[PDB]
Each structure stands twice: as C-alpha cells, then as structure tokens.
C-alpha cells in the first residue's frame, strides 16, 4: 500500500501510449463533460494496465500529466481500488474466491489443490512469471459456487481434481477452457436441468398491454 523506489518503478523510467491506446483514451475523455475532464481517471489507468502489465508509478505520473492533475489524486484513486495492481505479476493472475458461498461448496480444496500443484503462497507469484495467486472476495458469481478467475474469465463449478487440470493446462500455454465452467448446467440453470422457461418461443407483450396506453 506504499511504493519502493528501487528498480523498474521510478518517476524517471519512461512510459508512453500506443496510438490505438491513445485514440481509445481520447474516445473515453469525450464521454464526460470537459469541466470534469479528470473524472475519467478510473478507466484511463485501466488502459495503462492493458498496455503495461501492471500499474507502475510511471503510468500514473503520465496520466496525471495527461489529465492536467496533481499526481496525488491519481495516487489516491489507484491506491483506493483493488484491481490496479501495483506490483509486477506473472502472465496469469489467479483470482480465487474465498467468500462463504464459494466456501460452503468447498473452495478450500480448490485453493489447496492449486497451491499444492504450484508451491506458492496466495500473495506469492510463480518464479517463472506464469501464475500469480490472489485470494479474492465474492466476485459476483456466487451461485456457481466453486469458481475462480483467470484475468477476465471466471471459471466456475470446479472440482479440485478437475481444477489442477486447468492449472497445468494454462501452464502448458494455449489451454484455457472456453470461458465457462466444466460444461455442466449453464450459468443460471439448476444442477439437474432447466425446470422453468421450457418454452421454445418468447410470449409477446404486444397483446399483453395495459389497455390504457
């Protein structure tokens, strides 16, 4: 929650934008009123996290110069949020949930299977710059309860025996899942099968009117 000025993180190390990233940032700033031109400080740094793999200090200085701001506001906003990760991580960011709905369906064995297939602590990263563990709280996918998150794709409904498959799968390079779980249910469907809404067609509101319109 602070910064060390040692190496690869300096105000002096340079950072620029890709021109596609530059044009995208210029697209984002126009979405807001020009009086609050600083109000785009959240997703703009996101673009930095897309360009450089972690939130450096240099990207924050560059955005504060870009938005005509004192740098401490950028410092505050990217400190106050979880996702702007200020340390260099591996290629694959493990975001394994720990919250009780994930836990009651056994997220413990999930994490233990991961860090026994790897050998690292939940703040520690893999020394090959491949996998970076992170425990995280309920990511909104609570119904599909044993889940996790590769960088954007939540992987759901995991058995810990089947999970270490996915772990060494991503370790091989070119093998993630398609994005959903292990091809069971769907996302909202029951574990057995679709009970309600077994109609092939949308019933229309065109007759279902108030009659006073």
């Amino acid at each position: 929650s602070v910064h060390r000025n040692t190496e690869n993180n300096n105000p002096s190390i340079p950072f620029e934008f890709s021109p596609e990233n530059m044009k995208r940032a210029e697209e984002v700033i126009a979405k807001y009123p020009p009086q609050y031109k600083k109000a785009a400080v959240m997703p703009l740094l996101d673009i930095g996290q897309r360009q450089l793999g972690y939130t450096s200090i240099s990207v924050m200085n560059y955005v504060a110069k870009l938005l005509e701001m004192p740098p401490m506001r950028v410092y505050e906003v990217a400190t106050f949020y979880t996702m702007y990760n200020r340390t260099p991580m591996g290629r694959y960011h493990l975001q394994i949930c720990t919250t009780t709905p994930c836990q009651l369906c056994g997220s413990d064995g999930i994490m233990e299977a991961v860090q026994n297939t790897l050998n690292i602590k939940p703040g520690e990263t893999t020394k090959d710059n491949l996998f970076t563990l992170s425990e995280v709280e309920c990511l909104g996918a609570c119904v599909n309860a044993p889940m996790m998150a590769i960088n954007d794709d939540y992987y759901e409904d995991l058995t810990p025996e089947g999970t270490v498959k996915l772990l060494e799968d991503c370790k091989a390079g070119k093998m993630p899942t398609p994005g959903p779980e292990n091809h069971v249910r769907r996302d909202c469907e029951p574990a057995s099968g679709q009970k309600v809404l077994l109609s092939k067609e949308p019933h229309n509101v065109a007759d279902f009117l108030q009659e006073g319109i």
Binding site: V2, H3, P11, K65, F80
Partner: protein, 692 residues
Amino acid sequence: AEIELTIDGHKVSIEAGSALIQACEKAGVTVPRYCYHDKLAIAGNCRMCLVDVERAPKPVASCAYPVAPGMVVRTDTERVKQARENVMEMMLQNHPLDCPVCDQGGECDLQDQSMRYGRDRGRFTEITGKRSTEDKNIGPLVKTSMNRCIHCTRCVRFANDIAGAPELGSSGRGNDMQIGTYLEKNLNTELSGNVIDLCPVGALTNKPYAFRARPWELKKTESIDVMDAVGSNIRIDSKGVEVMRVIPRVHEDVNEEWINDKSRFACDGLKTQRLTTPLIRVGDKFVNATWDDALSTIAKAYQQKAPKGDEFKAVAGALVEVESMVALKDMTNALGSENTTTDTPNGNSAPAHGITFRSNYLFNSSIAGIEDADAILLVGTNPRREAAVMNARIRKAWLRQELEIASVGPTLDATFDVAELGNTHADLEKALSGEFGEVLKNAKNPLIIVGSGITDREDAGAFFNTIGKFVESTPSVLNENWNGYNVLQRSASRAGAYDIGFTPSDEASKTTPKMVWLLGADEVAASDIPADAFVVYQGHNGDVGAQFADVVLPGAAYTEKAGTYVNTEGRSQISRAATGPPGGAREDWKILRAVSEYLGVALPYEDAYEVRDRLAEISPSLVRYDLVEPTVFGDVAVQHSLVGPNGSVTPSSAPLTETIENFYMTDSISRSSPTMAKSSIAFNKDNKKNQA
C-alpha cells in the same frame, strides 16, 4: 434570515444554513470534536460531534447537520452519553502507547477529551494486536510518526485547499489507509510547518523542537512575529531562558490563525549565534571589552573623526524596533546630520515615493477586504514568498469567489492560477492600456498590489509614474471607502521606519560618511561602506553586519524586549517581552540613550513612558495601538506620489528579477539558524521536492 432553536433549553439564534456545531459554540454548550475546523472544509470523519436531535432516528454528527428551525438539540441523552464513550473507545484501540514519548503531552486534544468521556478500561487485550504504520519521512521540518495518526483528515484538507500543496492524500482502505505521498517525497509549501499545530495528536510535530520541553513547563507570552510583513499575532513558548517555540494565537483579520513557516522555525537562530558582550576591533581581530570601553571608544573615535554633518550614516534593518528607531532619529538629528537611510539597495535616497501620505507606503485596502476582492495584479514580487499569510488569503478568495489575477515580472509558481503579462515596465505599460484598464474600471472592489523589490530598482519612479497615473485615471480603483494602491515590505519594520521619517535627504544622499551606524541592517556590502568609516554595529547575533564592524553592541532581539511594530496594514502592535536579554545584551533604545550621553546629545527621556510620549509626538497613531484607520486622502496622495518622480526617472529594460535569493535564508536569523541552512539545502529542484 436567521434561525432560532433550542440547545439544552438554551434558545439561541444563528444565521441560516450554517453548521450545528457553530450553534453549539454560540450557545455555550461545549461539544467535543476531532475533525471539525472553522477555516476548513467539513468532513464528518471524526464521529465525535454526536448529538441528539428531535426528529432524527439516530444521533447525528453536529458538524455537518445543517441548521433547521424549530430544532430541539439535546446533548445529554443517555444514548449520546453512551455514544461518546463508545466512539472514544473505538478510537483508542489502534492508537499506540506513546503518551510519554508523544510530543503533545498536555496538549493532546484527544487525551483531555478522553478523560471526560473515556471509558475506565480499554478491552484491547487481543493477542496479535494493533496495526502499525511506516515512518513516512517527509522533510527536515516536520517530525512524523504516522503510527499515532487517526486519519482525522485535518492535515490533508488544509494542505489541499488553503496551503495549496496537494501532495498530501489518503491512500488505501481500512487500516491500510495512510497519509502522505507514498513516493516518500519532500513536502513544501511556503507555509509548511502549519500542519503540526493542526494535527490534534502528535503524529505530525516539530522536528527541531522535538523533545526539549513539554507544555506544562512553559511560560507563554502573547507577542508579535517579525521577519514578516504581516506581523502575525503569535505566542512565544519559553522555558524562561531560551525560547522553545512559537504558536500562532488566533486573530481574525491579520492571520486567521495561521503563521509563516519561517516565522515558525526561527527560534533556532534566536539562541545559537547571539552577541553576548561588546567586541571592539583590534585590526582583523575582535576582543570583547568593558561595556564602558566600547562606548568610550565610540566617543573617542567621534572626537577623532568629527562628522560635523552629512557624514554620520545611520542605517537600520529588517527586524528593528520602531521605539529604537525613534532613539536613532533623535540621536542623529541632535547630532546634526540626517544621513538616515534604509538597508535596501537604492535606499540611499528617498524610496522613489512620498514619505508623506501613509497610503504611499501602506496597504490601503483592508486585509479583510481581500475576501471582497475582484481582480488584482502583482508587480515585481512573489507574494507566495513575501507574506505567505497573504497567499493563504489569496487562495481562499480565489477558491471562494470568482477572481482574476495577473502577474507582471518574475514567473512564480502560485498555488492559484496566475496570468503572466511580461517582464518589462514597457510590457507593464502595455498591459495597463491593453485590457485591464477596462477590467479594473469594470471591477467592483479590485486592488493593485506592489512588492517592495521595485524599490531596489533605480527606475522605480517612472515605475510609479505609470501606476500612479492609472489609480488617478480610474475612479473605480480610487473611490472613497477603499484605495487600490497597495504596497508591501519585506520587513516588519520598514513600514514603521517610513512612519518615523527614516529617509535621507537629496543633500544627504551625496556625501560619503565617516561614521556609519549599523542597527541590525545585515545586507550592507563593502561597496555601501566607506573605507575608513566608523562602523559600530548594534544587533543581536553575528552576521555580515557584525563582520565589517569596529565595535559591536549586543542589543536584544525581538523576543527579549517590549517591542512595538507596524505591519504593512499599519497595525501598531505590542511585543510583550518573553524573557530578559541574555548575557550582556541590553535593549536597543536604552543603549542609544547612553551613546547620546557620551556625546553632547541629551535625549529628554529615561523611561519607557517618556518614550511612549515621544513616540506619540512623532505619530499618535502608533500609541493608539492595533486599530486600522483608512485614509481620507486618496486622490491628493496618489497625485502627490505622481508629481514627485514625474518624468525625471527614465525606465530601462531591466527585467523584473526575483526580490530575494531564497526564502529560508534572510534577515540574519535564517542565516543564524542551522535548521534553516538544512531547510535551504533541501528546497531547490530536488527529486523529492520536484513534482513530476
């Protein structure tokens, strides 16, 4: 337009839309708090001003609840009496056990607050314990132990909004919240040290006065700051021999309970390089001597040199007493020579404007009028440097109302938004007729503000003659109830000196003297002094002025004497003496009395009251203390300022360079104090003091 309500039976009326905590202050019912402040923005972080409100489901904070009519305010509900103990107990479970090492021992607002309303016990007895926080180096001025911080936000809102250094900030959630740059970079705004009077715990405290004393040992004395044009109303904390620290006592107009940084840490030079005995030159060597022998050498070398007229140079300095300069002027003109000149370069003449018509050398609007200001322009100055209290007023005005500032001359970094115009008096004259002859005619309560550094320039008079025309030309800037011409000084005393009539004549400006009188006045050079001149220094410490001298005279500094000072506003203010003059130093005018006695000069006084009557003779506005009068002579004063230096001054293209070299190195005490040496080195373009 006002609202009357009931706090604990006490009916009280207050202006509408205000905060409830001010109504509690007005009613006399004391409500404790941690993060309310008058001059700051309101955040309800402290949770202390909890109070019972009829038509409220829960007790609410009194700091941010707005005043509504028909209000019944109760403070002694058992729910509220429960709540205050609750919140105190919640606060005291991560604050660390530092009460015998914390600086604010008796002055911990939290602590006295936790005696009335605190719990008996505290059931922190957890095993694995409190949080803990990094050391957080900031600078050589502000001692910092962030472990004792409670995130009361009172630091950061101030340095954000009014001090204008937005480097402070809150970083992290929960107990991972910290205060400050996590670069570990140097903070500096030109009122930097004002946060250590402001953090109510000893998280931020005083670095040179770190552990030297402790606020029940202290003798307090209300007095006046010098080395500052505003003369802020301060309080001296003294153990009884030395001077421990200074804290700004509250005053509405002149400082609004703030103080300059250099005003704060100046006590170091007040105790380390002082003149303690008279030293006579042997020839490349000073030896100390009998206090008779010094003044007898003065009389003897007077009989040797014999300056019969226009050869007795008398120069005073930046932090010198009005009451002492009275004795000076009396001695020089009973001696028979008005070679009576200021320390400033281009001080060897009159300062290119009228010593008459006090408006010519004072601040003609009120400092309170700057809240009502509209659109002003600085010339030849850095008001961030000179009178940083003024800069606080400027930034408060610029945030509050809608304003327009121009800046002509040196390119400064303001806290606010400047608009530069040029670096030439021709560029200035282009700017007056360019667009602001319309704006300042348009503006309702503007002003126009002038630093004293232009007095250094020999082309000052035409520099006056343009601006003296403009005030004459525009009746908006020159109306009855205020006057827009506003000048500042670099000292707390050259305004008082210009009340004295401390100016040489045109005849007195010509002859090289034989007997130079130093009274403070550090910034003379070897060029400003004749070769064989008799150069007796009278001061408090050892500076350049004492280095050239023949005999030095230890006079008391601004602390030890019953001083009298006049700011640029014109407030005559008493400096109550906090201690006696140490060693063999004496008071200044008492020295000048004996120096008169060993000559033929008989000063008609021997006491303080007789000086007060002589000072009433020079000007009765200086015995009528600390009450600002306006000037009924606006137009005649501006016109007489115009007519004098009219035409004869030919303005060159000299660029309007900076008045001072560094802020924290001036006035013989910032050079005396080692804390301002180490302040000076850390404060120029350093990577911790840089922004990007």
